[PDB]
Amino acid sequence: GSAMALKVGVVGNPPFVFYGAFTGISLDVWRAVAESQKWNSEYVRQNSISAGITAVAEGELDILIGPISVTPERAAIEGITFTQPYFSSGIGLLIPGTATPLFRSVGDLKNKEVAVVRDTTAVDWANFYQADVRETNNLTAAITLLQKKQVEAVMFDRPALIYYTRQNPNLNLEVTEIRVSLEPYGFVLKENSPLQKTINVEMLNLLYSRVIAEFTERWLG
Amino acid sequence: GSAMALKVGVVGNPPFVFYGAFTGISLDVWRAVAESQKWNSEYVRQNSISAGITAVAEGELDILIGPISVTPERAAIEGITFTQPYFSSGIGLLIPGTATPLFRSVGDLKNKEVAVVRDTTAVDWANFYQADVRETNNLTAAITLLQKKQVEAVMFDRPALIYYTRQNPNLNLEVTEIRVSLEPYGFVLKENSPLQKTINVEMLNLLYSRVIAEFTERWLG
Ligand SMILES: N[C@@H](CCC(=O)O)C(=O)O
Ligand SMILES: N[C@@H](CCC(=O)O)C(=O)O
């Protein structure tokens, strides 16, 4: 097809998004949608979810894809609308194997030095649970702070934390059973976008046919 | 407030919707949204989800509330759009206590006489799993068919089935551990509705603040 390409902003971490050029669960979901419509895409990495959402509202992007948590604050941003969610995720905690007795509930987060990645929902949850929040630029940085000793835990999306531990079994880090929150992931479109219905219908088809589950199993099963 | 009332279509069964005038989890969610905006409502019972969706598309209703499963086929209906989902439900099976050994998986549904309520997602799931589908007008009718012997099971939303058994412990009916599907519940608005963002933001607030969980616990905890 020689039709104008949709400008797709990409943000997020493994296993939902990997940067080569772009792969992961979120990319698999988007590509299945685009292919079903024979649409062309032009991918543009975004610095953060906030930057990406503004780019969609300002018309610089047609859609923002990735493991984007659907939150009240984000849904309130003028000019944008979320698609139906395609994944139900949880925000968890990564800690040293020796610290497992210390982290048994969210109440245990109070006053503990917790590392979080900037512009992620974890920043707000860590503040809400009264932790000693230490913001970092990326997950690697947050985990490097855990490997040193500045922090006692890293709060971030559970699938990303589990994926990380699986690439570094040598580290002896553990993802607690604690679920700080349950959050749905969705894509972001311009409000009243003429693409909204088509995208929702296709994402729902992928969801109900268990195709999204297959994508997830390929990266985290 | 003397502002024009929003026309709210109501459809569904307990514990999400009860008909006096209207109560239940779905009504609690909607009322919390309306109250936060100081909106006036005018409730109109709908015969079915399909009828209700058409009424929203045709402008007869401003919104359709209830335990409405967000499906690809419904999302594809012209002129409407679903809100963000507010509940994650499962479609289950109600069977006699003596039949528990017979229903251990969806594969066991093949050729079994299954009762379903017309215009519910269960009709499609029962057909998909190759059951001997017997459509009925309402849940009471489907269960009355189970109490007789025309059917070997009733396929319907799990929370409604559990609620039913709890009002009739004398019956000795059991809700199997089988989950035929996992489906999100949402409300239906007119496509590009000027109410969409406000409604989504409020429903998300209720969700994240655990208020929706409190509503559910009040009727099924
Ligand atoms: N789900 C997180 C982002 C997770 C990630 O960057 O992988 C958020 O929406 O803030
Ligand atoms: N969730 C079902 C309806 C359940 C009910 O009527 O209570 C559907 O969307 O078909």
UniProtKB/TrEMBL annotation, chains A, B:
<feature type="binding site">
    <location>
        <position position="69"/>
    </location>
    <ligand>
        <name>L-glutamate</name>
    </ligand>
</feature>
<protein>
    <submittedName>
        <fullName>Slr1257 protein</fullName>
    </submittedName>
</protein>
<feature type="binding site">
    <location>
        <position position="74"/>
    </location>
    <ligand>
        <name>L-glutamate</name>
    </ligand>
</feature>
<keyword id="KW-0472">Membrane</keyword>
<feature type="binding site">
    <location>
        <position position="121"/>
    </location>
    <ligand>
        <name>L-glutamate</name>
    </ligand>
</feature>
<keyword id="KW-0325">Glycoprotein</keyword>
<feature type="domain" description="Solute-binding protein family 3/N-terminal">
    <location>
        <begin position="6"/>
        <end position="221"/>
    </location>
</feature>
<keyword id="KW-0675">Receptor</keyword>
<keyword id="KW-0812">Transmembrane</keyword>
<keyword id="KW-0407">Ion channel</keyword>
<dbReference type="GO" id="GO:0016020">
    <property type="term" value="C:membrane"/>
</dbReference>
<feature type="binding site">
    <location>
        <position position="13"/>
    </location>
    <ligand>
        <name>L-glutamate</name>
    </ligand>
</feature>
<dbReference type="GO" id="GO:0015276">
    <property type="term" value="F:ligand-gated monoatomic ion channel activity"/>
</dbReference>
<keyword id="KW-0406">Ion transport</keyword>
<keyword id="KW-1133">Transmembrane helix</keyword>
<feature type="binding site">
    <location>
        <position position="157"/>
    </location>
    <ligand>
        <name>L-glutamate</name>
    </ligand>
</feature>
<keyword id="KW-0732">Signal</keyword>
<feature type="binding site">
    <location>
        <position position="67"/>
    </location>
    <ligand>
        <name>L-glutamate</name>
    </ligand>
</feature>
<feature type="domain" description="Ionotropic glutamate receptor C-terminal">
    <location>
        <begin position="6"/>
        <end position="221"/>
    </location>
</feature>
<keyword id="KW-0813">Transport</keyword>
